Design a protein around this ligand. Sequence first.
Ligand code: FZ1
Ligand code: CO
Ligand code: CO
Ligand code: CO
Ligand code: K
Length: 304
Amino acid sequence: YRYTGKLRPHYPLMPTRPVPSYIQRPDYADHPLGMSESEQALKGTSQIKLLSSEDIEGMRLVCRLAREVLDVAAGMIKPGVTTEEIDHAVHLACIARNCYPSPLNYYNFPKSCCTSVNEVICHGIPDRRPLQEGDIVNVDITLYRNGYHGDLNETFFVGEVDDGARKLVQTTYECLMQAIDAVKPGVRYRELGNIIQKHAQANGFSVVRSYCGHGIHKLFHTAPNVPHYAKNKAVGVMKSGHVFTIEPMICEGGWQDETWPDGWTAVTRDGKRSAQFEHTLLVTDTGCEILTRRLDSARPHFMS
Ligand SMILES: COc1ccc(N2CCN(c3nc(-c4ccccn4)nc4ccccc34)CC2)cc1
Ligand SMILES: [Co+2]
Ligand SMILES: [Co+2]
Ligand SMILES: [Co+2]
Ligand SMILES: [K+]
């Protein structure tokens, strides 16, 4: 394999971390290939669930707990800390909150969260590499509680970063927030990508095309599919009671991605840096509720 940038995987991975039997498990947790029966039974479906009142309460709880866990990871972002160490803290924090770490064994993903440094667009596997001053790093958290998944991510700075890293991370966050601001009943899902790309393009940045936002509730990933680029062909119209993510991945150079031989790690083909932010949203009558918001601070971690 020819690597696209400086980053390399740092093996071996510590042995898989068990989840105590008392924590409720998603269907794929024990599947040998980590396949989700409940997901696959709906593969190829455009129909979007309308959440019930109990569904909404279940989503509010898990998305609040997921935010608490992301905040734990944020606290550890410093030079010299390995991504595996982050993952260990995240694993324990999910368990402490009576939650299963959703990524763990999801289609055989080996860890409890995704840590995506510099040119990694997404799905970086936590490993022995110590974080380096100047790095940017996304940690993507999903928890599973009482049958429901809650999903968020943020990009962080490791120590002091250069001007381009600041510009990329700020713009990616702006893209997400501008898209969130457009969410309300009657809006087509395909529209968010127009908003996101317009802002990214205006700042000299490209938009990843291979990975999308997603419906989430009793399923980790389900309808709607939500592209982040312009003139996409997404199917569906927002309605009150829809729950989905917007999770734009934005790049310094081109939009093209490829995957490492591990089958997971998605990287820029040019080896330039990529950043991502994510919230789980509930469409309401006035617009939408940001289920994964911070409750005690106005801003994401990279600002404060
Ligand atoms: C035909 O059966 C399949 C169904 C789905 C998939 N996948 C794997 C799961 N998947 C997504 N996975 C992830 C992910 C996985 C592990 C850890 C963190 N994230 N993120 C996604 C985000 C958006 C859409 C899909 C996926 C969609 C494509 C493969 C085969
Ligand atoms: Co993912
Ligand atoms: Co997501
Ligand atoms: Co996520
Ligand atoms: K990254």
